[PDB]
Design a protein around this nucleic acid. Structure first.
Length: 346
DNA sequence: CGGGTTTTTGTCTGGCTTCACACTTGATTTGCATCACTGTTTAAGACAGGCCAGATC
C-alpha cells in the first residue's frame, strides 16, 4: 500500500472522471477521453505507460476492420479471457447520451511494441438491456460454456415519462439480471425476487461460477445498501438458470475501485459512505471455494490533499496497481486542473 | 316581419367667454451632433519537416 504521486505529460486534459484502463498482456491502455477524438489520435485509445512516475499518453491505431467507437464515460468493462479480449457495454457518449452497443477490444497486431487493436462491435437481440451506465458486466464459466451476467445501474427516464424540465434526471434501472451469449450475442432477462431495489456504481466480482455484487448507491431511496449478493449461474444443455442469495459482511460503498492483488484475493479502494463521506478504509476480499472473506488492511497512507478534497476517480492498471485522480485547487488556482496518483497494492 | 319608444342628436339667434393669433427682432433655451480619450494576446489545435535514435537487414 505505497501511494505515490505521478507526473503527467502534455495531453493531461484527456483524463476525466469515468475513464477506463484496459489491460492487454501486461500493458495498459487508456480509453474514454474528454471530448470527441481529436485529430492527433483518432481513436482515443492510448498507451497509458507510466515509467519513473511519469506517464505518456500515446496514440494507438486500430486495425483495418475495426469500428471507431465513441469515448464512453461510464461503461461496463469485463476482461473476457476466452484470445484475450475486453467487453464494453453502455456509457455516456460525449453528447451526454446512452449507448446500447457492445464492443470487443482485441489486439490483432503488435510489433515493435506498436499495438494494433481491433474494436469490433456486436449487437444484441432478445431481452436487450436498456441503455444505461454505472452498471457492471462480468463473465462466468460453467460446464465449459460461458456467459455474461449484467446487473443494471442507473439510466435516463424512458421515452414517454421524460420531460424537458427534467430532461437530464436519472433513475436506477429495474434490478433484473441479464445473461448474454457473446457467440450469438443473445440476451436473456431474469427477475430475481431477493433483489428488489435498483443499484448503480456497485462493485462486482466474478469467481468462475458466481458473481459477488457488493456496495452500490441506490438512487430510488438515496442510500448505500451494505448487503452483498451472490449470484450463482448454472449452464445446462438447454436453458440456463440463475439464483441469488444475500450474504452478511457486506459494505456500504459506491464508486469503489477493485483489483486482484494475488490469485482470488482482491482489494477494494475508496468509494463513498455518504453523500459527503470520502471513504478511506480499504477492503480485502479474500475469496474462497464458496465463501467470501471480507476484511481490511491498514488504510493506506493518504496525503493531506487527498483528505482535504471531496471526490476522486480512477481504475485498476491491472497488476494490483490502482490509479487515482483528484481535482485541482480552486483557491490555489495555479493548479493543473487535476492531480494524480498511483498506489501499488503489491 | 315592418311599425313604433327609448337614446341621442340637430337646433334656435344672443351675448359670453378664453384664448389663439396676427408681426416684428433679438435674447434666451433646447436638440443633436461632434470630440478627445480610454483596452495595451493570443489559447487550443492541425500539419509539416527535421533531427535524432533506435530498430532491422
Amino acid at each position: 500500500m505505497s501511494l505515490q504521486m505521478v507526473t503527467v505529460g502534455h495531453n493531461i486534459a484527456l483524463i476525466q472522471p469515468g475513464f477506463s484502463l484496459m489491460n492487454f498482456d501486461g500493458q495498459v491502455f487508456f480509453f474514454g477521453q474528454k471530448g470527441w477524438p481529436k485529430r492527433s489520435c483518432p481513436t482515443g485509445v492510448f498507451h497509458f505507460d507510466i515509467k519513473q512516475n511519469h506517464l505518456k499518453l500515446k496514440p494507438a491505431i486500430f486495425s483495418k476492420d475495426s469500428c471507431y467507437l465513441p469515448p464512453l464515460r461510464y461503461p461496463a468493462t469485463c476482461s473476457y479471457k476466452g484470445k484475450h479480449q475486453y467487453i464494453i457495454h453502455g456509457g455516456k457518449t460525449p453528447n451526454n447520451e446512452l449507448s446500447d452497443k457492445i464492443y470487443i477490444m482485441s489486439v490483432a497486431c503488435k510489433n515493435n511494441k506498436k499495438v494494433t487493436f481491433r474494436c469490433t462491435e456486436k449487437d444484441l437481440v432478445g431481452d436487450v438491456p436498456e441503455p444505461r451506465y454505472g452498471h457492471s458486466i462480468d463473465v462466468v464459466y460453467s460446464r465449459g460454456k460461458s456467459m455474461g451476467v449484467l446487473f443494471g445501474g442507473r439510466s435516463y427516464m424512458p421515452s414517454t415519462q421524460r420531460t424537458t424540465e427534467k430532461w437530464n434526471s436519472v433513475a436506477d434501472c429495474l434490478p433484473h439480471v441479464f445473461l448474454i451469449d457473446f457467440e450469438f450475442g443473445c440476451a436473456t432477462s431474469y427477475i430475481l425476487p431477493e433483489l428488489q431495489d435498483g443499484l448503480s456504481f456497485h462493485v462486482s466480482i466474478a469467481r468462475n461460477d458466481t458473481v459477488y455484487i457488493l456496495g452500490g448507491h441506490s438512487l430510488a431511496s438515496n442510500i448505500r445498501p451494505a448487503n452483498l449478493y451472490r449470484i450463482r449461474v448454472d449452464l445446462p444443455l438447454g436453458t440456463p438458470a440463475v439464483n441469488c442469495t444475500v450474504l452478511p459482511g457486506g459494505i456500504s460503498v459506491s464508486s469503489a475501485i477493485l483489483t486482484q492483488t494475488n490469485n482470488d484475493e482482491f482489494v477494494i479502494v475508496g468509494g463513498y459512505q455518504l453523500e459527503n463521506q470520502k471513504r478511506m478504509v480499504c477492503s480485502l476480499v479474500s475469496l474462497g471455494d464458496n465463501t467470501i472473506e471480507i476484511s481490511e488492511m491498514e488504510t493506506p497512507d493518504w496525503t493531506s490533499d487527498i483528505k482535504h478534497s471531496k471526490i476522486w476517480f480512477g481504475s485498476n492498471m491491472g497488476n494490483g496497481t490502482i490509479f487515482l485522480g483528484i481535482p485541482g485547487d480552486n483557491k490555489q488556482a495555479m493548479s493543473e486542473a487535476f492531480y494524480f496518483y498511483t498506489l501499488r497494492c503489491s
